[PDB]
């Protein structure tokens, strides 16, 4: 059973809809607001995560198309062939650059991404922190801290966290955080349509 | 089975029974087990001593085993399963018949048969004709029976080591490849 | 309850994950035995696998890189530069047999009621410590040194330290299991352990047949070699 | 179960369709036994057929696309590219006879009065639970897992979730008995399922003929 | 009725008397004791015969020679089926003679299974008490006397096991013979049968 103020009904979805945009309101033709609280939370977090990934992908696409490559060597230290980020850039456009990336580099990147995914999904970590799983009444999008000294801390200390490593939010006001969440949802949708547009082009 | 003899210090101080046939065995079944153990012990000790004596350069008996057929002790080669093969079939039947008569005797003469009370492995005819062990204390006799069982278990492994050497060459180390 | 103890042990092993029994093997009634006996068996299997895998990992580094005792012995028939899978294949057949048999004697002593009772302990499936190798205090002939802690470095160690050491033993044993089979898998399904690619050579031969190839039949004993 | 219980079950499976027995099998007394036991047998039949047909749908998709086990010789012996019905006919008959006898041992285990009443349930015809399968607790020898949930999942499931799952089981079974037969009918009768034209490979044999050589006339041995 | 008290009901048939034809209800108790005695006799003969057929099909034969001219393997080198002919006439004559003696003694014991006796408990020392006949007191059943270590409850459990194994062996022996006769009848039987 849900025990939080997280949205669990079409009324709350409509409230958040007018909050993010008074004009559109709730645009739900498929009627996936007519679902259980757990599914509503799942859809909320899915939207948020697509926003994160789409924004990151769009900014990466812009930087890679501009051609601001890295100055290092990507391989060739532990007795392997030498490949440079300049070579990766000269491979082609962003999809071609990803294709030109070596296979274990891809595997390690995807592994770190999955590590962050599971640190998000781990209910015990959120409850050691101040949250629960987004399906069972948790805030959609909260990343638990990777730096900690609790029993749920890594064997070796981690320096910083994923979100807010140096407190750029610092103390944003108790509701301007929600304002930024609204702006984030809108910008995530915009970046979603944008990145699919660039990929289609 | 805990009361019966055989538990020396070599297997803890307890009965050796992985499968647990003693658990199935009643008192008379344990009597059968001890009687069979003892008979295998004694036959094996005789067999291994004879094999060692014959095949370790010991003096073969003099004269002819069979004057009529010409078979001699020396003609019988000092090799396991060759001396027996070359022994006359009549002599083989003599040995087997004497053994069979003795075993029917040890079954019919003992009155409280090892199965119905009695003592397993007691054969009054053959033991100590000169009475060599007729004035030993009961403890000493128990110790000597324990020694009998321990020697015989080793003897029955040894006789099979000899047998499996002939039938499977190079089975046993520290033993000739042939026999 | 045994499952409660196992759950707490899992939290100690990793508190973020905790108890993770996806198959319910703790709940399953193996051999019809109760949950306590089943969990004792499963825990003992875990530590046994982990211990043997840790020793196997260190042995893989020893054999593959080249680490041999000098003088007469099994190491003199193994070709120099042989792979870790090839060392076992190249030692004599009797050497393989006596290694496995000595391990068998150790296992037998480990589960014997005699030694465990002389040490005032019980079998791990009947209310005992899962993973406890007893002292050789009933081996008919005295043995100088025991298997665990032969020099008795831990004769006065705190129970809390011993519990933490067992928690470490389980974790490192699991990790060593994964690494050792990483080595084995890289030699038969290449490109499966990405880091080990190019390091572990391919091995054509059944790992799980101990006696294939049977290895040489040499006689390495010199003085008193009447069995040859 | 009573016919009122069947009406309630139908109205929970599909509120609009509701109770839709037009042939009155629910009313015909099977073998002279009461309606409450004919309902049990019919409901167990529905659940069992749906189960076998769902498994058969997944298995037909697996066989037509030749996703075979990698470390067996029978699968290697069977030629590749055959129609899924032929992937059954190309097998040693001794393997067919052991699949079938495995189902026989399992369905002897299920209907057993002693095992069912030891675990707490009764026979589906004796007011028990239709579509239940007792675990192997009273088995002669130990075995590692049961059939239903060999692992632990749903050992702590609510009765509400179980009721929802049984409703979904019946509905998906009703649908899969039609999907699998759509595959078979399109295979053995081209242009029978209009939407699978050119998708299901064709077939000539009889899907209701398990063994190549007729067991009733001339079997084969190994 | 005497049927309700006997052993033989198992968990397989729901712990109920397996009599579809109802002959157990029809016939009297005396015929029921005959039927139980015959059941156990067939079952024990079949538990012997099934393992005998397995050994013959494996061609596992004793090392030696049955007669002075034929080997145990020579007799068994044509499968179990064509074995009784290859056995010498005298050997099977002696086998059937001792079987006749055992049958006659077990039937000649006074407390007959029908007329006031336990069905299937043929006397454990046949040939004893016969005027003008002496044989060793080799207990027919369990001469090693494994029964002494079992209580009555264990004996009942093992009698249930006896009946069930006997029934399975009666099926299995005819399965083997049919597998030889009709080649495809019983699957999982190779050409040795
Ligand atoms: C056929 C020979 C034989 C027989 C009849 C027995 C019989 C017995 N031994 Mg055993 N024993 C034997 C050979 C034999 N032993 C050998 C060779 C060794 C040395 C390894 C031992 C070592 C030994 C010890 C240390 C002890 C016994 C004891 C016993 C008794 C209890 C266990 C039991 O029920 O065994 C029943 C045995 C059988 C039914 C025969 C086994 C048949 C299998 C199929 C053979 C497998 C061997 C394989 C082919 C090689 C019982 C009187 C205990 C005793 O006396 O307690 C008071 C005891 O402490 N025995
Ligand atoms: C069960 C054991 C056994 C068996 C099967 C045999 C079998 C044989 N022995 Mg004998 N032998 C035995 C015990 C046995 N021996 C023992 C214990 C000894 C040491 C005293 C000998 C010493 C011995 C010699 C020196 C010779 C034989 C020889 C023979 C052969 C002819 C028979 C004979 O004269 O036996 C005689 C056996 C006995 C007098 C002892 C029998 C044991 C009971 C307990 C007394 C035959 C292969 C002859 C042969 O052909 O050698 C190549 C031969 O020259 N045996
Ligand atoms: C020929 C052997 C034989 C005999 C004499 C019996 C005798 C008996 N069985 Mg049966 N039984 C047999 C074979 C036999 N069984 C086999 C092979 C099985 C395994 C399927 C069983 C399984 C079985 C069960 C599970 C039970 C019995 C029971 C009984 C008893 C009551 C039924 C009766 O009157 O049978 C009289 C039997 C006959 C007249 C033999 C039938 C002969 C026909 C012509 C054979 C038909 C062809 C073949 C299919 C009785 C003691 C019940 C019991 O123990 O009650 C206490 C019981 O519950 N039997
Ligand atoms: C020529 C053959 C022959 C001879 C000489 C005998 C002699 C005898 N039979 Mg007969 N008998 C024969 C063939 C023969 N039988 C055949 C072919 C059968 C069919 C199987 C029988 C079946 C038979 C039975 C069923 C009985 C006899 C009995 C007797 C004995 C009766 C006197 C008695 O009790 O003495 C005193 C007893 C003895 C000296 C002990 C018996 C001695 C030997 C083993 C007989 C007597 C010794 C009766 C008897 O008492 O036998 C023990 C008896 O019950 N016989
Ligand atoms: C020398 C030392 C002496 C030792 C004395 C010990 C001694 O002899 O003990 C004798 C003894 C004993 C004992 C005890 O006293 C002991 C030791 C201790 C005490 O506690 C307990 C007791 C009990 C008192 C028991 C004996 C039991 C026997 C013999 C049972 C024999 C049983 C054969 C069967 C079932 C054959 C089955 C055949 C089948 C199923 C055939 C078949 C098939 C297949 C081919 C498989 C495949 C096919 O599949 C398809 C077609 O798909 C199906 C089918 C049906 O066609
Ligand atoms: C190296 C390798 O790989 O394997 C090894 C091991 C392996 C394979 C097993 C081997 C073997 C064979 C072995 C071990 C054979 C063992 C044989 C054995 C143990 C043979 C005992 C006989 C005892 C007798 C005859 C006793 C007579 C006893 C008599 C005559 C008496 O009554 C004595 C006594 O009455 C007096 C006179 C006076 C009385 O007051 C007191 C008593 C009653 C006491 C190998 C080949 O060697 C090599
Ligand atoms: C199987 C085969 O073929 O093997 C082959 C190959 C293999 C194994 C490699 C071989 C080898 C090499 C081996 C085994 C080499 C061994 C070398 C060895 C054993 C070397 C010790 C040195 C110790 C020193 C200097 C100690 C000084 C110690 C001192 C200063 C003292 O005594 C001090 C003190 O004690 C006093 C005096 C008494 C007290 O008042 C005070 C104390 C306690 C402080 C062999 C031989 O080739 C055989
Ligand atoms: C021609 C035209 O015009 O139309 C049609 C004709 C035709 C032929 C009908 C067509 C079709 C295809 C159809 C309709 C196919 C339907 C197939 C169907 C209906 C297949 C179900 C499988 C279900 C399985 C395996 C379930 C396993 C479920 C298991 C083992 C569970 O674990 C159950 C579970 O409860 C537990 C125990 C625990 C809980 O935690 C929850 C879960 C869920 C995990 C076409 C091609 O579309 C076109
Ligand atoms: C423990 C067993 C045993 C006993 C108790 C025993 C007792 C007696 C007695 C009683 C007082 C006499 C009088 C006697 C006499 C003869 N024994 Mg005899 N014997 C035993 C064993 C063997 C074996 C193994 C052989 C054998 C033989 C002969 C020959 C040779 C005849 C010939 O040259 O034709 C003669 C005359 C050999 C044989 O028959 O060879 C064909 C032969 O190999 N015996 N034997
Ligand atoms: C291959 C065969 C197969 C398929 C394809 C299949 C599919 C589905 C689907 C489809 C989407 C759902 C949703 C579903 C749900 C449930 N199944 Mg089911 N199932 C299969 C087999 C078995 C067996 C053997 C058993 C079983 C059971 C249950 C229970 C427990 C209810 C309770 O315990 O009250 C629930 C909730 C057990 C039982 O008792 O059912 C009354 C049981 O023994 N199922 N099952
Ligand atoms: C120290 C230690 C442990 C250990 C260990 C290890 C690895 C132990 C290994 C031991 C090992 C490998 C021991 C081999 C012995 C070989 C022998 C006895 C051979 C004799 C051979 C003989 C007697 C041969 C004799 C003859 O040929 C001769 C010479 C000539 C003739 O006159 C007579 C005959 C023909 C018969 C524990 C306990 C496991 C744990 C603890 O924590 C620490």
TrEMBL record, chain A:
Residue sites binding chlorophyll a 2 per the record: 49, 117, 136
Location in the cell: Plastid, Chloroplast
One of the protein's GO biological processes: photosynthesis, light harvesting
Broad class of where this protein is predominantly found: plastid
MF annotations from Gene Ontology: chlorophyll binding
GO (cellular component) term, any one: chloroplast
Top-level division of the source organism's lineage: Eukaryota
Protein residues bound to chlorophyll b: 52, 146
Key words of the record: Chlorophyll, Chloroplast, Chromophore, Photosynthesis, Plastid
Protein residues bound to chlorophyll a 1: 27, 47, 50, 184, 187, 189
Spans through the membrane: none
UniProt name for this protein: Light harvesting protein
Source lineage: Eukaryota, Haptista, Haptophyta, Prymnesiophyceae, Isochrysidales
Entire protein: shown range: 13 to 213 of 260
TrEMBL record, chain B:
Listed GO biological process terms: photosynthesis, light harvesting
Record-listed chlorophyll a binding positions: 22, 37, 40, 148, 151, 153
CC per GO annotation: chloroplast; membrane
Species for this entry: Emiliania huxleyi (Coccolithophore)
The keyword Plastid is assigned to this record: yes
Protein known as: Light harvesting protein
Entry-linked InterPro entries: Chloro_AB-bd_pln (IPR001344), Chloroa_b-bind (IPR022796)
Keywords, alphabetical: Chlorophyll, Chloroplast, Chromophore, Photosynthesis, Plastid
MF terms in GO: chlorophyll binding
Lineage: Eukaryota, Haptista, Haptophyta, Prymnesiophyceae, Isochrysidales
Main subcellular location: plastid
Secretion signal span: none
Location within or outside the cell: Plastid, Chloroplast
Positions contributing to chlorophyll b binding: 42
Domain of life where this protein originates: Eukaryota
Parts of the chain that traverse the membrane: none
TrEMBL record, chain D:
Positions contributing to chlorophyll a 3 binding: 69
Residues that coordinate or bind chlorophyll b: 26, 51
Gene3D superfamilies xrefs: Chlorophyll a/b binding protein domain (1.10.3460.10)
Main location: plastid
UniProt record, GO biological process: photosynthesis, light harvesting
InterPro entries listed in its UniProt record: Chloro_AB-bd_pln, Chloroa_b-bind
Entry keyword Zinc: no
Binding site for chlorophyll a 1: 20, 46, 49, 169, 172, 174
Name of one Pfam family that matches: Chloroa_b-bind
Residues that bind chlorophyll a 2: 48, 107
PANTHER family on file: CHLOROPHYLL A/B BINDING PROTEIN
Protein name (record): Light harvesting protein
Organism annotation: Emiliania huxleyi
TrEMBL record, chain E:
A Pfam entry, by short name: Chloroa_b-bind
Protein's organism: Emiliania huxleyi (Coccolithophore)
N-terminal signal peptide: none
GO cellular component, one term: membrane
Keywords: Chlorophyll, Chloroplast, Chromophore, Photosynthesis, Plastid
Residue positions binding chlorophyll b: 44
Binding-site positions, chlorophyll a 1: 18, 24, 36, 39, 42, 160, 162, 165, 167
Gene Ontology MF annotations: chlorophyll binding
Domain of life: Eukaryota
GO biological process assignments: photosynthesis, light harvesting
Residues annotated to bind chlorophyll a 3: 38, 41, 103
Name this protein carries in UniProt: Light harvesting protein
Plastid found in the keyword field: yes
Locations listed in the record: Plastid, Chloroplast
UniProt keyword annotation of Plastid present: yes
Residues annotated as binding chlorophyll a 2: 34, 42
